[PDB]
Design a protein around this ligand. Structure first.
Ligand SMILES: *C(=O)CCCCCCCCCCCCC
Lengths: 86, 604, 41
């Protein structure tokens, strides 16, 4: 029960009125999901690789983490943002 | 002597090197000094007591004599060859390691055995308060027994062994006096194994209770030396450590705290509004800094803590200005170029970071509670760190709103969510904060009568004030507890202060007509309420404008009095109001005698 | 309360027993035995 599903209820509600800033490993925001690791609302922050909650403050410039992979997809929330960004 | 026993390994001549811990197949014999036998005897004594229940239930294995775990070796016994050389002991009584093991696991195994029975004996014993504290009071035995024959639930152990528990009991309750076999009558005196101890716990009518009054003193003495109540108003740098600040996370309500009432919180007092923008998660929001002054947590003077601004139950008027709804509330830092309180318009605000936004706009976080939609209890929360703000002269934490589109409706709103109950928790005790600066040492005396009414209640969790308050608070419970600062007894506390008022009012009279000879009946009484007002609300001694209490003498004075006062209480300190206290105990025994009278009738 | 006889020097239902608290002898075994490191040795 790592995920804490009150967090995931904040993921989807930030997806619908898309906010969902996608941040890379060099703490810059992109919209492509390929170079991006951190996922915000901006309440909660989750690295897309390990898929764990990191900080409730977003502004991911102040987060320490050590993970490295090439997976955690659902891209579906990422896809739902750009549709709802219009 | 003490420690393990040693013996001349080189034989005969025992020098500071021809020794060696006499170890062997049993482990090392450690000496059993006089007092350490008191314990193991006192422990075994409390087990032997349960002898009648060990045989009854075929457990146990005979009485445990401490003389079965020891030996009678002889040699030099110390902590090290060097010092063991000065303790030649002959035929001392040592207990070998492997033995120090059994006397241990035996007292442990037996301790379980009895701990159990001893629990059954109790639910039955205390189940008829065999303890009064004034005069006597009987309860005809027949009834008593025929009564518990009932109450006691079918799974006790006092029903399976009545006079197998009774014999254990007689030695613990000098209430139950067994009827002597050859005169078939009681004994007047009751002889329970705890003969002395039980004699010295009775609430002696002369003075409350020696066992009580004695401890309430040694207890206070502990604190007095411990925390460091002594030196409470010392005038010189003291490491925060000296204040053992722990479990210390205070919560507020900013956006209310005046900036001058607490340095760690400045405000944007500017004419118009200061709508700024910032791309947060793609979407562009506008921080407002609305109509009012919008008090914001300053970042400097903010001991790297864990700021957790809770926004709940607080109003959320998205009903009127629709502008408010849609905006995700979020705690955001704000770096300004020109110092705040001088920051006029948007071009002044360097940048704005959303350190922690709330997913989902202001229309899901709501909840209607009679028209006025409130905020569903949620906690936004940064983790400010001393150095993440290095260089940056101006930066402020602000729990604002982040409106997705400013409008005319939100022209008098001012979205500061600071009205919420923010809870800062210093996450790095070593560093404190004072008057707006971060330090590593306080100067106690400085913080006395230096805060204002609310320059105290507005203190920042683990800051000098909150530390020079946590401290007085201990010293406040030592007096409140041990010393009698709550009766007309002009105690040692209110007495230390009176001597200061005199010496003080006496020199202020020196030079000039001296038309007023010091009072004293009025001084004693003035200092009595001064020492009393302190015990009452320890805090006050920090607020500017408190009679007596805030002069440099007092406190520094008080404590050092209260100090020596505890180190002399005697034992019979309980003599204070030991009259009404006594008369109240007789009052209880008269009512409890009334109880035994029914146990005595109902169950004849 | 059935008669026993020798197991223990006193019968419970024995002749002339007597429950009777006296403010004078507060019943107490040995709970506060000191064992802390410094104090036990
Ligand atoms: C026979 O066992 C009848 C019941 C009488 C005594 C049972 C236990 C209640 C009285 C306790 C006596 C020992 C200490 C309470």
């Amino acid at each position: 029960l790592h995920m804490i599903p009150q967090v995931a209820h904040a993921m989807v509600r930030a997806a619908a009125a898309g906010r969902l800033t996608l941040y890379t490993r060099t703490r810059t925001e992109t919209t492509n999901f390929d170079h991006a690791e951190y996922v915000t609302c901006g309440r909660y922050t989750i690295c897309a690789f390990c898929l764990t909650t990191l900080a409730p403050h977003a502004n991911v410039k102040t987060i320490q983490d050590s993970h490295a992979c090439s997976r955690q997809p659902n891209e579906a929330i990422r896809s739902l943002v750009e549709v709802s960004d219009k | 002597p003490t420690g393990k026993l040693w013996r001349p390994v080189g034989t005969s001549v025992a020098t500071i090197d021809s020794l060696a811990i006499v170890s062997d197949r049993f482990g090392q014999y450690s000496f059993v000094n006089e007092g350490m036998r008191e314990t193991f005897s006192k422990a075994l004594f409390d087990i032997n007591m349960w002898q009648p229940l060990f045989q009854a239930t075929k457990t146990g294995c005979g009485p445990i004599v401490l003389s079965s775990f020891t030996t009678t070796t002889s040699g030099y016994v110390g902590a090290t060859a060097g010092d063991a050389l000065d303790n030649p002991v002959t035929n001392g009584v040592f207990i070998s390691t492997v033995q120090i093991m059994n006397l241990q696991r035996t007292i442990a195994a037996r301790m379980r055995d009895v701990a159990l029975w001893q629990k059954h004996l109790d639910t039955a014993m205390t189940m008829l308060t065999p303890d009064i504290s004034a005069g006597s009071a009987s309860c005809n035995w027949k009834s008593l027994l025929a009564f518990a024959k009932d109450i006691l639930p079918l799974d006790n152990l006092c029903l399976t062994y009545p006079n197998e528990f009774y014999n254990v009991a007689i030695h613990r309750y000098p209430a139950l006096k067994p009827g002597n076999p050859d005169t078939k009558l009681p004994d007047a005196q009751a002889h329970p194994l705890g003969e002395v101890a039980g004699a010295f716990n009775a609430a002696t009518s002369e003075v409350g209770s020696l066992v009580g009054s004695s401890s309430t003193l040694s207890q206070a003495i502990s604190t007095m030396a411990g925390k460091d109540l002594d030196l409470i108003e010392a005038d010189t740098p003291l490491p925060v450590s000296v204040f053992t600040p722990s479990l210390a996370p205070r919560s507020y309500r900013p956006a209310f705290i005046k900036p001058e009432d607490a340095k760690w919180i400045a405000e944007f007092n500017n004419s118009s509004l200061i709508r700024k923008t910032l791309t947060y998660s793609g979407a562009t929001y506008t921080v407002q800094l609305g109509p009012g002054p919008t008090r914001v947590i300053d970042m400097n003077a903010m001991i790297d803590s864990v700021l957790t601004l809770d926004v709940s139950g607080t109003i959320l008027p998205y009903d009127t200005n629709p502008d408010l709804s849609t905006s995700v509330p979020a705690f955001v830092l704000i770096q300004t170029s020109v110092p705040i309180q001088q920051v006029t318009t948007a071009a002044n605000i360097t940048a704005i970071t959303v350190v922690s936004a709330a997913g989902a706009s202001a229309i899901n976080l709501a909840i209607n509670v009679r028209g006025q939609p409130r905020f569903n209890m949620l906690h936004l929360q940064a983790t400010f760190e001393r150095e993440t703000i290095t260089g940056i002269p101006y930066i402020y934490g602000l729990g604002t709103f982040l409106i997705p589109s400013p409008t005319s409706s939100s022209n008098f709103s001012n979205p500061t969510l600071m009205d919420g109950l923010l809870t800062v928790t210093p996450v790095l005790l070593r560093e404190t904060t004072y008057k707006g600066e971060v330090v590593d040492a306080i100067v106690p005396a400085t913080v006395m009568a230096n805060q204002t009414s609310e320059e105290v209640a507005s203190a920042l969790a683990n800051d000098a004030i909150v530390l020079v308050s946590n401290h007085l608070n201990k010293l406040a419970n030592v007096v409140g507890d041990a010393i009698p600062v709550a009766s007309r007894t002009d105690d040692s506390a209110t007495s230390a202060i009176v001597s200061r008022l005199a010496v003080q009012h006496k020199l202020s009279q020196v030079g000039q007509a001296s038309p007023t000879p010091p009072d004293y009946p009025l001084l004693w009484r003035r200092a009595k309420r001064a020492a009393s007002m302190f015990v009452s609300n320890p805090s006050l001694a920090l607020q500017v404008g408190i009679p007596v209490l805030t002069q440099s003498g007092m406190l520094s004075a008080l404590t050092s009095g209260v100090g020596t006062a505890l180190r002399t209480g005697s034992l019979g300190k309980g003599v204070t109001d030991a009259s009404e206290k006594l008369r109240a105990r007789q009052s209880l025994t008269v009512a409890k005698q009334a109880f035994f009278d029914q146990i005595g009738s109902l169950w004849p | 309360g059935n008669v026993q006889t020798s197991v223990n020097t006193y019968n419970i239902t024995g002749d002339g027993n007597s429950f009777t608290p006296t403010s004078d002898m507060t019943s107490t075994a040995a709970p506060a035995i000191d064992l802390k490191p410094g104090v036990l040795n």
